[PDB]
Design a protein around this ligand. Structure first.
Ligand code: A1H8Y
Length: 316
């Protein structure tokens, strides 16, 4: 049901000089690669690694670049989609892996999406939790698509180096106790974060422990964000220009490999309606849906999650 880090097989792979990637491996069979979201760790797949291995799979759960035991280079440009995706491929190469299944959640959702577009020969199959695939529009700058959706106002507060960093890093134990909750325990409003001066502004001094997590697991995340900081994780937000430009090349291409889109009903930012037309560009796309389910899907509803994937991995 869970995973003891000191009971794992720990692996590391240098993909570039200052850049080594660490992961956790378990099981045999076809190779599955799990890529986490923000601000998390391979540990947030702790309910899915073991169930997946038992279904007959070679599972590799990752510390995405900038997190945990993976390297956190100081340059923002190192964090754009095009640079990260290529490093995934070098990753597969140095293990003798010709192809793989990729399954991403949140930001990791977007990464898994760029692989099936640009490197579909190494991608056996692709799946995403929350994150929808929406083709860029060549005539809407990214800062415009923020005007028309102020739910995303928080991205601007994130753009300035230093600022957002200070808030999340002053008291780490409060940050994760504040963030990792279910929708009905929420202590954040994404409405005018830029104006109010931050996120943890209307949030109590001593948050209560939510129902979903233990006082240990908060310590786990707390200690991982002690070596690297929040500079790395926040920079995944600050490459919107290049990502629009690179992405513009996909126009016309259609992913044709086996695919699956899974939405959650209490994610009020990565909202389900945002994927309504993903079938026009992905003709083979299967779907799933979960209810009562917020953002931290795997932690809230792990059994629903496990059943949907495993039924889909064995379908094709
Ligand atoms: C309910 O209230 C919540 C609100 C949030 C979160 C949890 C919540 O509790 C439940 C957490 C924490 C944070 C700090 C703020 C916000 C949202 C958080 N996640 C996020 O910002 N992910 C980004 C990467 C993937 N993105 C896309 O792929 C495309 C881009 C263009 O098209 C639209 C989707 C865009 C967003 C995920 C970031």
């Amino acid at each position: 049901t869970s995973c003891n880090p000191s009971d794992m097989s720990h692996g590391y792979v240098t993909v570039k000089p200052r850049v080594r990637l660490h992961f956790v491996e378990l099981g045999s069979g076809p190779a599955v690669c799990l890529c986490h979201g923000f601000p998390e760790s391979w540990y947030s797949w702790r309910y899915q690694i073991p169930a997946l291995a038992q279904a007959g799979y070679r599972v590799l759960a990752m510390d995405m670049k900038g997190y945990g035991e993976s390297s956190a280079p100081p340059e923002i440009e190192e964090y754009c989609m095009e640079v990260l995706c290529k490093e995934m491929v070098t990753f597969l190469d140095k293990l003798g892996l010709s192809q793989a299944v990729f399954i991403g959640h949140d930001w990791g959702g977007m990464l898994v999406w760029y692989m099936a577009l640009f490197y579909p020969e190494r991608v056996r199959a692709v799946a995403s939790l929350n994150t929808p695939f929406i083709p860029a529009n060549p005539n809407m700058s990214p800062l415009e698509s923020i005007k028309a959706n102020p739910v995303f106002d928080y991205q601007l507060y994130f753009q300035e180096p230093g600022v957002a960093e200070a808030e999340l890093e002053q008291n780490l134990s409060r940050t994760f106790k504040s963030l990792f909750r279910a929708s009905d325990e929420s202590v954040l409003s994404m409405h005018k974060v830029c104006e109010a001066g931050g996120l943890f502004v209307n949030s109590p001094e001593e948050p209560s422990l939510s129902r979903m997590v233990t006082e240990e697991e908060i310590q786990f995340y707390v200690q991982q964000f002690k070596k690297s900081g929040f500079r790395g994780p926040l920079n995944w937000y600050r490459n919107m220009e290049r990502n629009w430009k690179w992405a513009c090349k996909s126009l016309g291409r259609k992913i044709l490999i086996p695919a699956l889109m899974v939405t959650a009903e209490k994610d009020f930012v990565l909202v389900p309606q945002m994927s309504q037309h993903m079938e026009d560009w992905i003709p083979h796309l299967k779907r799933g849906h979960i209810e009562d389910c917020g953002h931290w899907t795997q932690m809230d509803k792990p059994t629903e999650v496990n059943q949907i994937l495993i039924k889909w991995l064995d379908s094709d």
